[PDB]
Write an enzyme that holds these catalytic residues in place. Structure first.
Site, PDB file in Angstrom:
ATOM      1  N   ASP A  34       1.082  -1.509  -0.005  1.00  0.00           N
ATOM      2  CA  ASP A  34       0.149   0.209  -0.108  1.00  0.00           C
ATOM      3  C   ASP A  34       1.186   1.665   0.188  1.00  0.00           C
ATOM      4  O   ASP A  34       1.615   1.514   0.818  1.00  0.00           O
ATOM      5  CB  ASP A  34      -0.745  -0.212   1.437  1.00  0.00           C
ATOM      6  CG  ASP A  34      -1.589   0.828   1.606  1.00  0.00           C
ATOM      7  OD1 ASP A  34      -1.840   1.118   2.084  1.00  0.00           O
ATOM      8  OD2 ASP A  34      -1.734   2.247   0.585  1.00  0.00           O
ATOM      9  N   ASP A 214      -2.758   5.246  -4.750  1.00  0.00           N
ATOM     10  CA  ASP A 214      -3.217   4.312  -3.349  1.00  0.00           C
ATOM     11  C   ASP A 214      -3.048   2.874  -4.027  1.00  0.00           C
ATOM     12  O   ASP A 214      -4.400   2.175  -4.495  1.00  0.00           O
ATOM     13  CB  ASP A 214      -4.175   4.836  -2.750  1.00  0.00           C
ATOM     14  CG  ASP A 214      -4.345   4.268  -1.605  1.00  0.00           C
ATOM     15  OD1 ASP A 214      -5.334   4.184  -0.955  1.00  0.00           O
ATOM     16  OD2 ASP A 214      -3.812   3.731  -1.107  1.00  0.00           O
TER      17      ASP A 214
HETATM   18  C1  LIG Z   1     -10.564   5.359   0.088  1.00  0.00           C
HETATM   19  C2  LIG Z   1     -10.981   5.410   1.075  1.00  0.00           C
HETATM   20  C3  LIG Z   1     -10.896   6.628   1.936  1.00  0.00           C
HETATM   21  C4  LIG Z   1     -11.295   6.749   2.977  1.00  0.00           C
HETATM   22  C5  LIG Z   1     -11.613   5.811   3.748  1.00  0.00           C
HETATM   23  C6  LIG Z   1     -11.181   4.680   3.693  1.00  0.00           C
HETATM   24  C7  LIG Z   1     -10.746   4.747   1.962  1.00  0.00           C
HETATM   25  C8  LIG Z   1     -10.482   3.179   1.486  1.00  0.00           C
HETATM   26  N1  LIG Z   1      -8.682   3.012   1.987  1.00  0.00           N
HETATM   27  C9  LIG Z   1      -8.483   1.654   1.923  1.00  0.00           C
HETATM   28  O1  LIG Z   1      -8.715   0.926   0.311  1.00  0.00           O
HETATM   29  C10 LIG Z   1      -7.554   1.065   1.954  1.00  0.00           C
HETATM   30  N2  LIG Z   1      -6.649   1.907   3.060  1.00  0.00           N
HETATM   31  C11 LIG Z   1      -5.800   3.188   2.268  1.00  0.00           C
HETATM   32  O2  LIG Z   1      -5.450   2.957   1.020  1.00  0.00           O
HETATM   33  C12 LIG Z   1      -4.930   3.863   2.427  1.00  0.00           C
HETATM   34  O3  LIG Z   1      -3.634   4.504   2.153  1.00  0.00           O
HETATM   35  C13 LIG Z   1      -5.618   4.955   3.111  1.00  0.00           C
HETATM   36  C14 LIG Z   1      -5.784   5.399   2.474  1.00  0.00           C
HETATM   37  C15 LIG Z   1      -6.150   7.104   3.032  1.00  0.00           C
HETATM   38  C16 LIG Z   1      -5.363   8.066   2.346  1.00  0.00           C
HETATM   39  C17 LIG Z   1      -5.604   9.044   3.265  1.00  0.00           C
HETATM   40  C18 LIG Z   1      -7.665   9.587   3.661  1.00  0.00           C
HETATM   41  C19 LIG Z   1      -7.558   8.281   4.450  1.00  0.00           C
HETATM   42  C20 LIG Z   1      -7.072   7.255   3.443  1.00  0.00           C
HETATM   43  N3  LIG Z   1      -4.287   5.802   3.939  1.00  0.00           N
HETATM   44  C21 LIG Z   1      -4.326   5.653   5.007  1.00  0.00           C
HETATM   45  O4  LIG Z   1      -5.059   4.158   5.927  1.00  0.00           O
HETATM   46  C22 LIG Z   1      -3.583   6.158   6.158  1.00  0.00           C
HETATM   47  C23 LIG Z   1      -2.933   7.448   5.778  1.00  0.00           C
HETATM   48  C24 LIG Z   1      -2.066   8.560   6.284  1.00  0.00           C
HETATM   49  C25 LIG Z   1      -1.260   8.164   7.292  1.00  0.00           C
HETATM   50  C26 LIG Z   1      -1.785   7.024   7.934  1.00  0.00           C
HETATM   51  O5  LIG Z   1      -1.592   7.366   9.007  1.00  0.00           O
HETATM   52  C27 LIG Z   1      -2.702   6.055   7.282  1.00  0.00           C
HETATM   53  C28 LIG Z   1      -3.177   4.978   7.714  1.00  0.00           C
HETATM   54  C29 LIG Z   1      -6.268   2.155   4.196  1.00  0.00           C
HETATM   55  S1  LIG Z   1      -6.485   0.700   4.878  1.00  0.00           S
HETATM   56  C30 LIG Z   1      -7.702   0.034   3.609  1.00  0.00           C
HETATM   57  C31 LIG Z   1      -7.957  -1.045   3.576  1.00  0.00           C
HETATM   58  C32 LIG Z   1      -9.166   0.503   4.794  1.00  0.00           C
END
Ligand SMILES: Cc1ccccc1CNC(=O)[C@H]1N(C(=O)[C@@H](O)[C@H](Cc2ccccc2)NC(=O)c2cccc(O)c2C)CSC1(C)C
Length: 327
Positions: A34, A214
């Site tokens: 990621d 991402d």
């Molecule tokens: C696209 C989106 C937006 C908001 C909330 C969740 C998602 C979907 N996230 C996902 O598909 C997966 N993740 C991702 O894709 C990660 O890259 C996530 C993406 C993101 C970036 C900025 C804001 C909010 C989220 N980023 C982070 O979790 C993140 C970002 C900045 C600092 C930090 O300490 C973290 C953990 C984290 S694990 C996960 C499986 C949840």
């Protein structure tokens, strides 16, 4: 080149995992590479959360290169929060090994319903240092450093489903992956892999947005405001209980998604964002776009893009390369 190659294997839906081992005994783990987080964690054996029940757990005695830490700490991802404690052991990525600092996860439930629902154990972040909790140097930065790879960069090569197999490459551009010539964008900051781009969603547009790439998510997002204007355009249907907007696939009138560099232009056809619902008939479609409010000018580009564009991340070059992938 000595270019370590990591195989991303996708799973019924459309998210991919990769193998990952930690330690002398080489315990194996399905992670998630990621470019959105910048840490690494593996659900530790010393966990008992249901989640962990059906999950590969890490156990430390078993190795002896396990150095102890225990400093307690947590991460709050977009879709949950995790708790545990730093440990430092041997982290190895197929061809390459390395002694690294990771989090031994104890308390999950939360990332939950998720965590079990998903074919994955851990996460290995690929962002910049400042994005990490506990200031940890991005592996790739820190193999290059130990001169165990040519340079500090990683590539995300993405295919499709039934078709073939995902491929994370560290240390080099492999032309075996793309078509045409690469274009680059310089990061607007060294946190995420964020870059400045002018963005049109078909008709409705926003200039000088902050976009980021991402590998972790399977969606594309943008400020809700920006969406509303768009969705309403092509009359989409948001069924409460289901968390995705549905819509006709054959939508006479199909907009592409524009991403404009000063002198490059990146587009995403309607087919790279949409999915039958329903797998028998191509009348209704599920969109990969979702309104999220990070900032007011912040977008996120997940698989959907990388499915089309072989993407290149260059730490030293402090930039990211784009180019169309082989199929
Ligand atoms: C696209 C989106 C937006 C908001 C909330 C969740 C998602 C979907 N996230 C996902 O598909 C997966 N993740 C991702 O894709 C990660 O890259 C996530 C993406 C993101 C970036 C900025 C804001 C909010 C989220 N980023 C982070 O979790 C993140 C970002 C900045 C600092 C930090 O300490 C973290 C953990 C984290 S694990 C996960 C499986 C949840």
């Amino acid at each position: 080149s000595e270019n370590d190659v990591i195989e991303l294997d996708d799973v019924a839906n459309l998210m991919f995992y990769g193998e990952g081992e930690v330690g002398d005994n080489h315990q194996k783990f399905m992670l998630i590479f990621d470019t959105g987080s910048a840490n690494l964690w593996v659900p530790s054996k010393k966990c008992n959360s249901i989640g962990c029940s059906t999950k590969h757990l890490y156990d430390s005695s078993k190795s002896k290169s396990y150095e102890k830490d225990g400093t307690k700490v947590e991460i709050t991802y977009g879709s949950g929060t995790v708790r545990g404690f730093f440990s430092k052991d041997l982290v190895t990525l197929g061809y390459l090994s390395l002694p690294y600092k990771f989090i031994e996860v104890t308390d999950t439930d939360d990332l939950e319903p998720l965590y079990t629902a998903a074919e994955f154990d851990g996460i290995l972040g690929l962002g910049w240092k400042d994005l990490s909790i506990g200031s940890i140097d991005p592996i790739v930065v820190e193999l290059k450093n130990q001169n165990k790879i040519d340079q500090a960069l990683f590539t995300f090569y993405l295919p499709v489903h039934d078709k073939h197999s995902g491929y994370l490459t560290i240390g080099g551009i492999e032309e075996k992956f793309y078509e045409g010539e690469l274009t680059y964008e310089k990061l607007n900051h060294d946190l995420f892999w964020q870059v400045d781009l002018d963005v049109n969603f078909g008709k409705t547009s926003m200039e000088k947005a902050n976009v980021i790439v991402d590998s972790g998510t399977s969606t594309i997002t943008a400020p809700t405001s920006f969406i509303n204007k768009f969705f309403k355009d092509l009359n989409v249907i948001k069924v409460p209980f289901l968390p995705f907007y549905i819509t006709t696939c054959n939508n006479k009138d199909m907009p592409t998604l524009e991403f404009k560099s000063a002198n490059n232009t990146y587009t995403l056809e309607p087919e790279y964002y949409m999915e039958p619902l329903l797998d028998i008939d191509d009348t209704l479609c599920m969109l990969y776009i979702l309104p999220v409010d990070i900032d007011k000018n912040t977008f996120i580009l997940g698989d959907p893009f990388m499915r089309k564009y072989f993407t290149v991340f260059d730490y030293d070059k402090e930039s990211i390369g784009f180019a169309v992938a082989k199929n």
